[PDB]
């Protein structure tokens, strides 16, 4: 995705912070699932 | 803009999703319904 | 200045490029 | 800087696997098929990891006699190990069937 030219930088930063914490959770649960398979 | 940009990205990590994306893709389902809505807009224009 | 109330339109084209690298890295994690 | 030029940069240093401050840092363990007992003081600490993070990787290893601690810092590192679980599953079935 290219960032929409109308968006505020505050909205974009809060949107990306939310997604990085979603991705942080799923990284640890997927890596924990890999560890059980080990 | 979003959906073209995701398939452009999936085809850039070279990532074979092991759960293969369901066939046809949900944006092709939506493209065929986007043809229906134009078809019925033409029907409702003929009738007007 | 840049304020957090700045739009993506207005941003210096260097920062505008780095933001379009960052937006790709965040989408990268969802693809993986 | 402005506040924003720090918020965005310290945020980018939270995603980047080359960062000491990466939010993604899992600790896996890998078995050493040499049958040779390794000194844990001889194991060369990974790049881009702190001393504190490596002390934890050595103190939570379930057998230091035969397992080396390995960091993962992105989903690329996770799947560069997931594909080797499938590689091992295929080999482990084939020797079970035979």
From Swiss-Prot, chain D:
Task: Give the top-rank taxon of the lineage listed in the UniProt record for this protein.
Answer: Eukaryota
Q: Where in the cell is it found?
A: Nucleus, Nuclear pore complex
User: Any notes on this protein's domains?
Assistant: Contains FG repeats.
Q: Which family does it belong to?
A: Belongs to the NUP54 family.
What is the stated purpose of this protein?
Probable component of the nuclear pore complex, a complex required for the trafficking across the nuclear membrane.
Query: This chain belongs to which protein, by name?
Result: Nuclear pore complex protein nup54
- Organism whose genome encodes this protein: Dictyostelium discoideum (Social amoeba)
Q: What is the lineage of its organism?
A: Eukaryota, Amoebozoa, Evosea, Eumycetozoa, Dictyostelia
Q: Its encoding gene is what?
A: nup54
């Amino acid at each position: 995705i290219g960032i929409n030219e109308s968006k505020l930088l505050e909205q974009l930063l809060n949107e990306w912070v939310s997604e990085i914490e979603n991705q942080t959770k799923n990284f640890y649960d997927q890596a924990k699932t890999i560890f059980v398979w080990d | 803009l979003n959906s073209v940009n995701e398939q452009v990205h999936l085809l850039s990590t070279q990532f074979h999703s092991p759960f293969s994306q369901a066939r046809p893709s949900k944006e092709m389902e939506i493209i065929v319904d986007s043809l229906v809505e134009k078809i019925d807009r033409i029907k409702q224009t003929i009738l007007c | 200045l840049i304020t957090e109330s700045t739009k993506f339109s207005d941003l210096p084209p260097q920062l505008k490029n780095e933001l379009q690298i960052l937006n790709k890295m965040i989408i990268n994690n969802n693809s993986l | 800087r402005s506040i924003i030029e720090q918020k965005l940069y310290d945020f980018m240093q939270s995603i980047s696997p080359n960062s000491l401050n990466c939010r993604f840092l899992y600790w896996f363990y890998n078995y050493q098929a040499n049958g040779q007992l390794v000194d844990p003081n001889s194991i060369p600490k990974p790049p881009n990891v702190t001393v504190d993070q490596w002390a934890y990787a050595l103190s939570n290893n379930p057998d230091p006699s035969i397992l080396i601690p390995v960091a993962a810092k992105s989903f690329d590192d996770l799947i560069n190990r997931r594909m080797k679980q499938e590689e091992t599953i295929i080999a482990l079935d084939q020797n079970t069937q035979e």
